[PDB]
C-alpha cells in the first residue's frame, strides 16, 4: 500500500520530535571578553579652551 | 594727579596676577594629565581613544550550510 511521494514533497522542511537534549555550546566557545566601559554623560566646555600654546580660546 | 587720572591701585594688578597664575597653573596640570592619559590609552586600548576597527559580527551568516560541520 505504498504511495509514491509527489513533486516537491521530499524537499519539504519537516519537524522532528526527539528526546535528545539541545547542545548548549556546540561550538565549544570560550568566554567573550568584556566590552569597553562605554562612558556617557553631559558635555561641558573644554577647561580653558584648546590649551594649545598661547591660545586663550 | 597723575596717579589719580592715569593709574589704578596695587590691588587690581595683584589680584589680576593671582587669577592669571591660577589659569596658567591649571592649564599646565591639564596638559600633563592629558599626555599621561594618551600614553595609557595607546598602550592598553581600553579607552575611547585609539580604537581600531575589527570585523563586524553582524556580517556572519548563521544558517545550515549544506554540510553538518559548518
Ligand atoms: C603742571 C603739569 C606738569 C605735568 C605735565 C604732564 C604731561 C602729560 C602728557 C603725557 C601723557 C602720558 C601718556 C598717557 C597715555 C596712556 C595712559 C592711559 O591709560 O590713560 C587714558 C587717558 O588717555 C589720555 O587722555 C591720553 C593723553 C594723550 C594726549 C597728550 C596731550 C597733548 C598731545 C597733542 C595732541 C595734538 C595737539 C593739536 C595739534 C594741531 C585712560 O586709560 P584708562 O584705562 O581709562 O586708565 C585707567 C585709570 N583710571 C581709572 C584713572 C581712568
Query: What's the 3-state SS for A3-42?
Result: CCCCCCCCCCCCCCCCCCCCCCCCCCCCCCCCCCCCCCCC
Phi–psi pair at A31, nearest 5 degrees: -75, 135
Touching A: B residues 36-65, CB under 8 Å = 46-48, 51
Query: DSSP 3-state assignment of B27?
Result: helix
> Is the CB of B8 inside a 6 Å radius of any atom of ligand 1?
yes
> Is the CB of B13 inside a 6 Å radius of any atom of ligand 1?
no
Task: Compare CB distances from A51 to B31, B46, B47 and report the shortest one's residue.
Answer: B31
Structure determined via: cryo-EM
Place of cell 569597553: A36
Strands (E), B1-70: none
- Give the whole-angstrom CA distance, residue A33 versus residue A30: 9
Q: Provide the resolution (angstroms).
A: 2.7
User: Max Cα separation, chain A?
Assistant: 98
- Give B13's contacts (C-beta < 8 A, 6+ positions apart): none
Amino acid at each position: 500500500g505504498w504511495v509514491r511521494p509527489d513533486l516537491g514533497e521530499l524537499s519539504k522542511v519537516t519537524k522532528v520530535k526527539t528526546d535528545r537534549p539541545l547542545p548548549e555550546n556546540p561550538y565549544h566557545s570560550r568566554a567573550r571578553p568584556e566590552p569597553n566601559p562605554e562612558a556617557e554623560g553631559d558635555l561641558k566646555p573644554a577647561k580653558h579652551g584648546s590649551r594649545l600654546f598661547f591660545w586663550t580660546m | 594727579w597723575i596717579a589719580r587720572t592715569f593709574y589704578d591701585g596695587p590691588e587690581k594688578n595683584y589680584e589680576k596676577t593671582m587669577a592669571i597664575l591660577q589659569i596658567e597653573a591649571e592649564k599646565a596640570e591639564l596638559r600633563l594629565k592629558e599626555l599621561e592619559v594618551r600614553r595609557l590609552m595607546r598602550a592598553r586600548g581600553d579607552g575611547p581613544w585609539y580604537q581600531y576597527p575589527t570585523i563586524d559580527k553582524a556580517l556572519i551568516d548563521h544558517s545550515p550550510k549544506t554540510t553538518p560541520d559548518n
